[PDB]
Amino acid sequence: SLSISDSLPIDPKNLAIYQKIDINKELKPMPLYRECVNVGTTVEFTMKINSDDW
RNA sequence: ACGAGAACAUGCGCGACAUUCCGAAGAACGCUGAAGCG
């Protein structure tokens, strides 16, 4: 009953590389860099559900 | 010097005519590219 559409395409301006920092009671730089959507971005999906189940 | 002697169970003729192997039917149901962080 739950359906999620794929998102509307994300503008490339909203993509940037971030570095992941593990925190085991202290910040620790690590060889993690990933392409991520920058904060403040709005993403649009279309959701269809039935009244009975959800 | 046989109820006998001759004497083709034969001739012309199509197993043929009319016919949809179709009718109904979602290859889809569920499923985070993610977990640990050395």
From Swiss-Prot:
It comes from the Bacteria. Belongs to the CRISPR-associated Csm5 family. CRISPR (clustered regularly interspaced short palindromic repeat) is an adaptive immune system that provides protection against mobile genetic elements (viruses, transposable elements and conjugative plasmids). CRISPR clusters contain spacers, sequences complementary to antecedent mobile elements, and target invading nucleic acids. CRISPR clusters are transcribed and processed into CRISPR RNA (crRNA). This subunit might be involved in maturation of a crRNA intermediate to its mature form. Encoded in a type III-A CRISPR locus. Part of the Csm effector complex that includes Cas10, Csm2, Csm3, Csm4 and Csm5. This is CRISPR system Cms protein Csm5.
